[PDB]
Structures are given as structure tokens and as C-alpha cells.
């Protein structure tokens, strides 16, 4: 957790108040420019495939950015530094399983501009390691937290 957040929580308890965590998802703090029309993903690229644009949203560029499925608070240092968010803060109060939701979102917008005719097999074939892409910091809290 960032230092200031740790102080705020401790400070609240000392005062007698109840600590309140931020509720929004990361995009809010994130400074990257979002398309007004909404998010649309064409192809999924690995963190080494390419040289990202510093202004445009990393998810729209085809990188798996977990900011969308991650609670704000950190100040979104990863996208600000040129890399996707890996969801280190975990989900919001309204989401139990971060990976499941991150996928739902990723699948929904993948090939949306060709929604009816886009191949649904492009995404699973593209991502070789699914667990490590969406459950990096939250596998134990997931509905299915182990491999049988």
C-alpha cells in the first residue's frame, strides 16, 4: 500500500473514526486518454510486442491492463511509467474475484467493432498463460484458488 494510505488508516483508528478505502477503479487516477466512444480492443499484444503510445489508454492499445478491474489509490504509477497495471491493489468492494471480472471485461470489448463476426478463438489462443495474466496477486482469494 502507498505510505500515505497506511497513515490515513492508522490515523483514523487513533482518532476513533472508521477507515474508508477508495471505491473507484484505477482508470480514474490514471492520466491516460480514453476514447469518448468507449473501449475497443483489436489484437492482444504481449508486454514486449511493440513500443506503446504514452498518451492513449493501454487497454485500447491491446495490452492486458488490470486497472479496469483494480481498486484505485496507488496513483496508477504503472501506466504512467509505460506498462500495464498488473492489478496489485486487488478488486473493488463490489468484486469478489478480480480475474474473473478482468476476463469478462477483456472478452466483451475484444473485437467489439466487429462484434458479430469477430472470431472468439483469437483471444484464448493469443493468451498462453491465463492464470498468471489475471490472478497474479489474487489467486488465493479467487473462487477456484488452486489447480487440481
Amino acid at each position: 500500500p502507498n505510505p500515505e494510505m497506511i497513515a490515513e488508516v492508522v490515523k483514523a483508528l487513533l482518532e476513533g473514526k472508521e477507515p474508508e478505502l477508495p471505491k473507484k477503479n484505477l482508470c480514474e487516477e490514471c492520466a491516460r486518454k480514453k476514447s469518448e466512444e468507449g473501449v475497443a480492443i483489436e489484437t492482444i499484444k504481449r508486454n514486449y510486442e511493440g513500443n506503446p503510445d504514452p498518451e492513449k489508454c493501454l487497454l485500447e492499445q491491446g495490452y492486458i491492463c488490470l486497472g479496469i478491474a483494480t481498486r484505485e489509490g496507488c496513483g496508477a504509477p504503472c501506466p504512467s511509467s509505460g506498462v500495464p497495471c498488473s492489478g496489485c491493489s486487488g478488486p473493488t468492494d463490489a468484486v469478489v474475484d478480480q480475474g474473473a471480472k478482468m476476463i469478462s471485461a477483456l472478452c466483451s470489448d475484444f473485437g467489439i467493432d466487429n462484434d458479430r463476426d469477430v472470431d472468439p478463438m483469437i483471444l484464448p489462443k493469443s493468451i498462453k498463460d491465463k492464470i498468471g495474466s489475471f490472478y497474479k496477486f489474487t489467486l488465493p482469494s479467487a473462487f477456484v484458488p488452486i489447480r487440481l
Binding site: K23, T92, K101, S104, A105, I112
Partner: protein, 651 residues
């Protein structure tokens, strides 16, 4: 805290006969928050409904769960019931223990009971997290749309018009009347078809409350009951309707010969034409696919009606209710190879025969062979072609084939008493008023012969063109091999080609027979599961003219209800964004096909916001939302989570 009432129905023996209801009712009591649980033979009935109403008051219930039939049938019924008791309709939950259990696990009673118990628990689990919601009161636009200008649709349009409601009738071809217009006479009265339909076609064309768009198609429909925004495409005839008189001089000089669709290919028409002489509107049309633009027709046109530079106009209209009456098509028998349709020249479909028998037909009412133009002395009618047949995927009865075969046999006899007409059948189905009498008369008065036997095949003599019919006379137990001059296939009814387009535009379902699906065969025969959309005529299923007309009137009555009220209740199961949780990721925006969720600025930050009028409550964006800020009322993730738990344990 929730105080749920559980009511297990027996539906007589439908449920009771398989599912041990009393046992489910005992189990229901053991579940958390269940303060009452009873079992009654018919929960939807008066004593059943009063039971629930009395208990909500006496025990102060804030939830109700009914374990019975599918909610697709009685969800509204019970919602109305509990609403009268003071309980919100959205605090009520339905457990499907009949269609989804008792009726499918009859030989496995013990498991059926256990499964019912799970479904009660599941339902009860969701019910705990249900919230009270307010039905959306929306206005009804005082206007009706009828799609399909056949006898069925003209009836609906005329009844609504006569009732004083603005109505729009859209007809694909250049003229109304439909199939009926192609028939010569109509059983059981043998009334000249067109002759009785024409005045209705004429009335509907000059009705003050009915706007007619012939040679037009509904290309896009959007909205919900009472608030439908439709777009009709007025196809380009390439002729000015206000200037045209329908004299038909143009056709006499046109050099292009196109097969007449109205005449089922038997006749040839010109590029410039009129479907039939009694057509309404009495105007002409140019078929650009075959027109060579020589300009010979313009020369004989007095009032300058022709215009080759015509743009097909799109008209925007707001309606409250929509009635579907696209009608039907005839079965293409080419698939039943043994009968030889398509290979043998003298094997015709009954619809083709109708066009031949018709006075205004391409043969001038003459039943002739297509091989030599001769008059057939012996005719064979083959029944159930494309019907009551699994090999062609049509395991249904087309309803009229028996009756029209006999009818057309009477007409050949009137025109030519010496003709030998044999009807090969399985069951003569003359079930309506005068039908059996019509059947008796066909044999007694006209001497029409009937063979009980489904023909095995048809074999043409390549020398004479005559056809031999192979079949078994089941009433004699002997095999027949009779020779005929013409073979008439009594082709069944199948949905019209454009039904798939209409289904998608209106958003209605199909029955196993591929025709449009009614809400409930007896509870609501012209209504559809989709509020505001209704059905009428043959598109709903194979039927005769009296039946289609009744449906047209029935549908108008049903469609007149919302329009008469002016206000209707729409389900509030819509998506909403929790502004405190949403960070404006933009995932939701494009998932909605109606564009309900849109990004907006609020309190200095970007947040998604759904436009309640545009949401149709599908549940894609809440499912897609990775922050959980977006939720669908009545189908929230926590409610579905509790329901998944309900299958395995109580909560």
C-alpha cells in the same frame, strides 16, 4: 429481515403425480426466513390466490415464493395477486417445478422431489436478496402498425381503423390481398375468392384512419411497448402513383417477358406490370432487374406516370403496438424426389393448379398439361405433401390441404364432368362448420374418388407424358398402379421467405413448426412473449380464411387494449451505475447495442451513466463491468450468487 411464504403447487397431478409436494412443503419450512409454507392443488386459482393474500396480511410476509409452472406463463398473474395484498411484485420469486422438473422426470420420482426441493431453496435464496422495484409507467403512442397486406392483416387494420385508431398497413408486394387473391374459389362455400376480398381491399385503401404503404417494407424497429419507433422503406416502383391510372397500355408494348411470381411460374408477365387485374392500389410497377430502359412504355403513357430516376423513400413513424401478419408460403416439393416435382412436366403443386383454374389466370381458367397444353382426362391429387412427414422435417398438418383438394376437384368437375379425379389421402380432415358436409358432397354429388393410401412414388411415361401413381389401397390391402394425365401435389404450408428478417426486426420466437410462436395457445393465442407485438393469420400457423379473419379481429382487440389505456407498465429490470464505484473505464459503453450507457462528467470526474429509456435490461454491460459498479436490478450478481449457493446449501 425476510419473512418468506412458500407455496408448492400440485397443478392437479401434473406436479403432484411425480413431485411429492407435501414433502417439499415440509422441507421449505426448514429453510431460513420461511415463516409459512403450504401446498394447494391449484395455486393460481381463487382459493390458491386468496391463501397467499390472507397469509401476507396475517403473517406480515415481505417475500413470496411459488413452486409451480414456468414464470413465462404465470409470472404476471402472481405479481398482480401479491400486489393486491400490498406486497411489491418484485419481492415475489417463482420456482419452476413443473416443466423444468415433474414433466421431465416422471419415471424418477424420488430424484424429482429432491430436485424440486433444490429449486425451492434456490428460489428462496434469491428471494432473500430481492428488492422492491417500481413498474415504469410509460405512455402509449396512439398508432398501430400492421405488417402484411393479406386477408388477416386487412382485417386487423380495418377493425382498429373502425375503432378510431390511426393505423399503418405495410405490404411487401405492389398489392394487398395476399394468397387469397391467387385462389379462384374458397371452400366450403366455393365463393369466388377475390370477389369477396376485393371490397375489403378497396375499403382499407380509402380508409380515413388507415395509411397504406404498398410495395413497402419495415426495415428497422426500435423501442418497447407503446414507444416503438419504426422505419418503413417505400420501394421505388419507378412510376408516379398520383399520375398513374392503371390502364395497362404500357404492358401491351413492353418487349421484356418475365415469369409471373403471382402465377407461380405458369404465366409470363412484362417488366412493367400489375400483379392481378383486381389489384389494389390499381397502379403499375417496373421490375428494374429485367427492364432494359428502351422507353417504349413511356410513349403510350398518357399522364406521364413513369420516372426511372426514383429514390425509394424511408418514412419514420412512432407506433404503440405492432401486429405481424406476413402469412405463408407453399412447400417446395422438389425434395420428395419420388413424386418427380421439377423433373416431370405434368406434376404440379396445388397452388399452381389454383392459378390455372382461376379465370384471371395465365391459362384463362383452363386446367392444362404443361407438356402439351392438353386438358387432362384423369387427375390424381396427392395429400400431405410436405406435411405429417419427418423426412422433410415437417411433422405437422397444414390444416387446409384436405379441404382445398376436394374443392379444386369440384371445380374441375363443374368445368368438365367427365374428368376422373382421384384423391390419395391418409385422413380427410374436414373439421369445421360445413367441412364434413363439403366432404360428403364431393363424393356424393361430384363423384370425386378417394383412395386411402399415401403414394410411394410417381413414374412418368416418357413417351406420352402421362404419370403412373404407385400406392396401396389400404382399405383393400392391394397395391394400385393407376395412370393419370396430371398429378397434383397438395403441398403444405411453410413460413414465408422473409419470416427470418421479420423475426429479427420484431424480436419474436418460432414454434417447432417454424411459424411464429404465440404467448400461450389458450391463455393468449394472438399475443407474443414480447409485449406490444402481436400475431394474425397463417404466419402464426397453418389455418383457413375464417380462422385468419378471426385472428385479425382478435389481434386488433388485443392490440387495442394498450392503445385504449394510453399507459402501460414496463419491467424496471434495468441497469444502473453506482457513481461511487465507477471510475470510467469505458468497457460498458460499446457492449450496449442500444447505446444506453454513456460516459459523462460528474463532480469533476468521469463516470458512466445509463439512459433508462434506452436500456432493455439484457444484462451484458453489468456482466462486462470489471468494477461491479454497473448492476441490473432483479438480476444483481449477489442475487445470482445466492441462487448458485441455493442448489448446494441454505443461506
Amino acid at each position: 429481515e425476510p419473512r418468506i411464504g412458500v407455496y408448492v403447487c400440485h397443478c392437479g397431478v401434473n406436479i403432484g403425480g411425480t413431485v411429492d409436494c407435501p414433502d417439499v412443503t415440509e422441507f421449505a419450512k426448514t429453510l431460513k426466513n420461511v415463516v409459512v409454507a403450504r401446498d394447494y392443488k391449484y395455486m393460481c386459482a381463487d382459493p390458491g390466490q386468496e391463501m397467499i393474500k390472507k397469509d401476507i396480511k396475517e403473517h406480515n410476509l415481505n417475500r413470496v415464493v411459488v413452486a409451480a409452472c414456468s414464470p413465462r406463463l404465470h409470472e404476471p398473474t402472481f405479481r398482480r395477486c401479491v400486489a393486491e395484498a400490498g406486497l411489491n411484485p418484485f419481492l415475489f420469486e417463482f420456482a419452476n417445478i413443473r416443466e423444468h422438473c415433474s414433466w421431465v422426470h416422471m419415471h424418477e420420482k424420488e430424484k424429482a422431489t429432491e430436485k424440486a426441493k433444490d429449486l425451492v431453496r434456490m428460489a428462496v435464496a434469491k428471494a432473500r436478496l430481492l428488492e422492491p422495484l417500481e413498474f415504469i409507467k410509460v405512455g402509449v403512442t396512439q398508432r398501430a402498425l400492421v405488417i402484411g397486406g393479406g386477408v388477416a392483416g386487412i382485417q386487423t387494420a380495418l377493425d382498429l381503423g373502425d375503432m378510431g385508431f390511426e393505423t399503418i398497413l405495410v405490404e411487401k408486394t405492389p398489392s394487398v390481398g395476399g394468397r387469397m387473391a391467387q385462389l379462384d374459389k374458397t371452400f366450403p362455400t366455393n365463393d369466388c375468392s377475390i370477389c369477396i376480398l376485393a371490397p375489403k381491399m378497396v375499403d382499407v385503401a380509402k380508409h380515413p384512419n388507415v395509411k397504406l404503404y404498398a410495395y413497402s417494407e419495415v426495415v428497422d424497429v426500435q423501442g418497447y411497448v407503446g414507444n416503438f419507433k419504426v422505419k418503413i422503406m417505400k420501394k421505388a416502383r419507378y412510376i408516379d402513383e398520383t399520375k398513374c391510372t392503371g390502364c395497362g397500355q404500357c404492358s401491351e408494348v413492353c418487349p421484356i417477358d418475365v415469369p409471373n411470381e403471382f402465377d407461380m411460374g405458369i404465366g409470363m408477365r412484362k417488366a412493367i406490370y400489375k400483379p392481378f387485374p383486381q389489384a389494389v392500389p390499381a397502379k403499375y410497377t417496373i421490375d428494374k432487374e429485367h427492364c432494359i430502359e428502351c422507353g417504349l412504355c413511356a410513349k403510350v403513357c398518357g399522364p406521364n406516370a413513369i420516372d426511372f430516376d426514383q429514390e425509394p423513400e424511408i418514412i419514420e413513424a412512432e407506433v404503440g403496438t405492432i401486429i405481424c401478419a406476413i402469412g405463408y408460403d407453399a412447400f417446395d416439393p422438389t425434395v420428395r424426389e419420388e413424386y418427380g416435382y421439377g423433373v416431370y412436366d405434368n406434376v404440379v403443386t396445388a397452388l399452381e393448379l389454383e392459378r390455372m383454374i382461376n379465370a384471371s389466370g395465365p391459362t384463362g381458367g383452363k386446367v392444362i398439361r404443361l407438356s402439351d397444353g392438353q386438358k387432362p382426362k384423369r387427375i390424381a391429387f396427392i395429400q400431405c405433401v410436405g406435411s405429417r412427414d419427418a423426412k422433410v422435417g415437417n411433422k405437422y398438418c397444414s390444416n387446409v390441404c384436405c379441404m382445398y383438394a376436394m374443392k379444386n376437384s369440384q371445380l374441375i368437375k363443374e368445368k368438365s364432368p367427365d374428368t376422373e379425379i382421384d384423391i390419395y389421402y391418409m385422413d380427410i380432415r374436414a373439421f369445421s362448420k360445413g367441412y364434413e358436409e363439403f366432404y360428403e358432397r364431393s363424393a356424393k354429388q361430384y363423384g370425386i374418388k378417394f383412395m386411402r393410401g399415401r403414394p410411394s412414388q410417381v413414374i412418368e411415361d416418357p413417351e406420352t407424358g402421362n404419370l403412373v401413381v404407385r400406392a396401396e389401397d389400404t382399405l383393400l390391402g392391394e397395391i394400385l398402379e393407376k395412370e393419370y394425365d396430371l398429378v397434383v401435389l397438395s403441398v403444405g404450408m411453410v413460413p414465408t421467405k422473409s419470416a427470418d428478417e421479420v423475426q429479427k426486426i420484431l424480436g419474436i420466437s418460432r414454434t417447432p413448426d417454424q411459424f411464429f410462436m404465440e404467448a400461450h395457445p389458450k391463455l393468449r393465442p394472438v399475443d407474443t412473449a414480447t409485449d406490444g407485438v402481436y400475431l394474425a393469420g397463417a404466419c402464426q400457423g397453418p389455418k383457413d380464411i375464417p380462422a385468419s379473419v378471426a385472428q385479425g379481429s382478435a389481434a386488433a382487440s388485443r392490440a387495442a387494449i394498450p392503445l385504449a389505456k394510453g399507459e402501460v407498465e414496463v419491467e424496471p429490470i434495468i441497469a444502473s451505475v453506482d457513481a461511487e464505484i465507477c471510475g470510467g473505464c469505458g468497457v460498458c459503453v460499446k457492449q450496449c447495442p442500444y447505446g444506453a450507457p454513456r460516459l459523462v462528467e460528474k463532480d469533476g470526474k468521469v463516470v458512466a451513466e445509463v439512459i433508462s429509456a434506452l436500456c432493455k435490461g439484457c444484462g451484458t454491460c453489468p456482466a462486462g463491468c470489471p468494477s461491479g459498479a454497473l448492476e441490473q436490478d432483479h438480476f444483481k450478481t449477489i442475487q445470482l450468487f445466492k441462487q448458485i449457493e441455493g442448489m448446494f446449501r441454505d443461506t
